[PDB]
Structure formats: C-alpha cells, structure tokens
Amino acid sequence: EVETFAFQAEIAQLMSLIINTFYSNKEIFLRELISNSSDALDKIRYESLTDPSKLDSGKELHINLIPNKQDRTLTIVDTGIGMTKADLINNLGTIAKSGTKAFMEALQAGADISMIGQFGVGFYSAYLVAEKVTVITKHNDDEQYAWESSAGGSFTVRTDTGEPMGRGTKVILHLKEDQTEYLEERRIKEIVKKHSQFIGYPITLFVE
Amino acid sequence: EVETFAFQAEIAQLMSLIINTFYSNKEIFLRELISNSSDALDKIRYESLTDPSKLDSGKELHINLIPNKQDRTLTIVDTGIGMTKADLINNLGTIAKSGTKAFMEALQAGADISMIGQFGVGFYSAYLVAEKVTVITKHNDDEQYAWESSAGGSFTVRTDTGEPMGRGTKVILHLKEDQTEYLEERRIKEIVKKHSQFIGYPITLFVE
Ligand SMILES: CCNC(=O)c1noc(-c2cc(Cl)c(O)cc2O)c1-c1ccc(OC)cc1
Ligand SMILES: CCNC(=O)c1noc(-c2cc(Cl)c(O)cc2O)c1-c1ccc(OC)cc1
Ligand SMILES: [Mg+2]
Ligand SMILES: [Mg+2]
Ligand SMILES: [Mg+2]
Ligand SMILES: [Mg+2]
Hints:
2 copies of one chain form a homodimer.
Chain A: E1 3-6, H1 9-20, H2 28-48, E2 63-68, E3 73-78, H3 85-89, H4 96-108, E4 130-138, E5 145-149, E6 154-159, E7 168-175, H5 185-195, E8 203-205
Parallel strand pairs in A: 2-8
Antiparallel strand pairs in A: 1-6, 2-3, 3-7, 4-5, 4-7, 5-6
C-alpha cells in the first residue's frame, strides 16, 4: 500500500530553509505552482501536435484553484501531462539536487526566496504556507499515484484509488493555521492578477 | 540535400511583428536564448539521473557565447538535450501556435515584447537582432541537423555534415548591420550580468 522514501540531503535542506527562514512574501508559492501546471500543460499540448490520441484522456487544457475553508485546503488542479511514479520519486520531475545547489549559491549573492523558480525547485515553496502537501497525478503511461509529505526528511507514494482524474496533476495544500488568507476569494484573485495574469491557460477560481 | 518549409501563418505573423515593430530594448534576445539553452540542459540532466549513458555524448553541461566580428556572428552553444529533425520542424520544440496567440492577446493587455518568453516563443526574439538565424542541433536519438531562416515565411532543414558536436544546440545569429554592439565583449558581459546572472550552468564568453 504505502511506500516511504527519504528526501535526498540537499532537498531536505531546501525544505528546512523554506520552513525556518523569516520571509514575509509567502504569496509567491501560488505563482510557482501555477507555473509548474503551465509547463505540464505545454508538454501535453506539444505531444498532441504530432499525436492527437495523447488527448483522449482529456482535451481541455486548464487550471482550477479550489479553496476549501472547512478542510483548510487550497487545491491546484491542472490537466497537464502528469507524472509517472518514477517522476514523483525523482523529486516530482525536477532537477532538485543541482537546482538546490544553484539556488543556495544565489542566496549567497543577494537572491531571495521569491527567485526559487529560476532554479527549477519552485514546487518546494509550497512549504511556505502548507504543513502538508499531497500531489495526486495521472500520466498517460501509468496509473494514478499520490505523493505526500509533511517535510521532516521523508515522503510517501501510494497508488491512488480515490477519484480518477483522467490526466494531470492535483496539488493539495493543507495550510498552516496562520495562512488561511490563501483561502479567501479576494486574496486568491489579487495574487493571480499580480503574478499569473499572462498564463496561457484558463485559470478558474472555484467559489465556496 | 535541402528541404524547404512554410512557417505556420501564426509564426510568420509573430516573426513579422518582431521584425517590424519599433522596440528599442533588443538586448533581451540573449536572455531568451540562454534560457532555452538552460531548459535543454535541465532536460539532459534530468534524463541522466535515471540513465547515466545519456551523457556518453558529453558529460559537461555548459553554455558558450562566441562572438565573431569578421563574420558578424554571435553564436550560442549549449550541451543540452538537443532537438530531433521532427522537433526542429515543429517550431524548434515550442508550442508556437498557441503561444503566439497568448502573446498577442497579452500585447493587447499592455504586455511588451520583453515578455515574449512567458509564452514559450522566446526563440523568435532572435529576429530583433539577426537577419538570418541558423540552428545546428544534435539529439542522442538522431543525426545532426541544421535549421535556417532569414524570415520571409520559410525555413530550411538539412543534415549537417559540418563539424559534429556530440550533443546539444548551436544558434548562429548573423547580425543586422546596425546591431554589431552584440559582438562587443563589454556589451555581452553587461547583458549576461543584467538578465542571466543566476543561470545554473557555466556561461563562458569567448575572446576574439
Ligand atoms: C515528466 C513530465 N511531467 C511533468 O513535467 C509534470 N507533470 O505535472 C507537473 C506538475 C508538477 C507540480 Cl509540482 C505541479 O504543481 C503541477 C504540475 O502540473 C510536472 C512538472 C512541472 C514542472 C516541473 O519543474 C519545473 C516538474 C514537473
Ligand atoms: C525536445 C527536447 N529538446 C529541447 O527541449 C531543446 N533542445 O535544445 C533546445 C534549444 C532551443 C533553442 Cl531555440 C535554443 O536557443 C537553445 C536550445 O538548447 C531545446 C528547447 C528549449 C526551449 C524550448 O522552448 C522554450 C524549446 C526547445
Ligand atoms: Mg539534478
Ligand atoms: Mg489542513
Ligand atoms: Mg501549440
Ligand atoms: Mg552576418
């Protein structure tokens, strides 16, 4: 059922830095995850140009933002290419080891945490606002898997028999108690407008 | 020997817009091409994490900038994943049709040409400074090919028997007569520092 893995030392250090550093501009997490969704959406679009059957699992290319105040969750859903189990394990398809090295060298030369995505590890900025993150994903060449981590040096991977998606990625942010502003419609809309206004795919903000 | 192709109507319109629009901040072309090199370098690195033999064609992951005043060329070379012939034909591995649509809609809502890379078509910004662009490329799963275009609605593709590279992409910018400042060491260095200072791979500026 549930497999447990250790984060590579560099990734664990990245996550601790993200968790323990004083850094007020937390809102950038949303731009980073929307950007990842957009990169995955680009990939399925590109593949479908030479093979339209890659879209049998879903033709609509889009991003949904789903706040749930009762569950204290902000969920980001895309219909991008999705990840294989192998991808999930290999730091969610990132070059996380080398990217972390460059990121921390940059923080040495006056970078700040908002620049995290320039190093291919924008995903981990989720830990600015979330105590636990769940990544549900479905790639055309594999089954649906759930990745999960509350940090602390380990993550899990299981097959997901919960709600089939067809194709793409769902990121569920179980928010820290003092970060509930990211569930407020007005705040989400402000953030999307500020940082994600030219994204090439529809972004739908769900109502509660 | 030489195959000739028509650009898709949207790409041809993109290139004309790039060529004919008054836009002083031309220097951004270099950041866009360095960014593409960095994305291709990420890809070969990622693949090599699960298969180290992907690096038999070259272990060093880097970017070279080669100005040649006599030839009036600025050449950008990377050891990234490279492109197949199919990739070259399909708008150099870009989602150029949809990306152009989004780019032009953005230019309607107060974007400017410097934001071109947000729409996955940063390559075409080469035409800000170049009258002709040649793309030599070698992917592990194919032979070495040369793509070439002086715009005007068409491009060529040939097999390249010229100097084998091993793996990666070489972009040769045959510069417009009034854009020779991009061959000056001081100017190249200024531009790299301004826009490409946190790139995760060595950038070597060649001396003449
Ligand atoms: C191997 C082919 N699959 C993908 O590239 C992919 N599919 O899905 C995602 C993805 C990842 C994350 Cl963390 C998201 O928040 C949203 C996504 O769509 C990705 C993805 C996007 C970006 C990325 O690094 C910048 C790595 C992975
Ligand atoms: C299909 C797998 N190959 C690649 O992705 C690839 N290999 O090579 C390049 C590339 C392209 C360009 Cl236009 C460059 O200036 C530099 C490159 O390395 C690319 C490339 C980089 C970026 C891109 O779109 C943003 C498309 C293609
Ligand atoms: Mg790495
Ligand atoms: Mg919660
Ligand atoms: Mg397209
Ligand atoms: Mg020339």
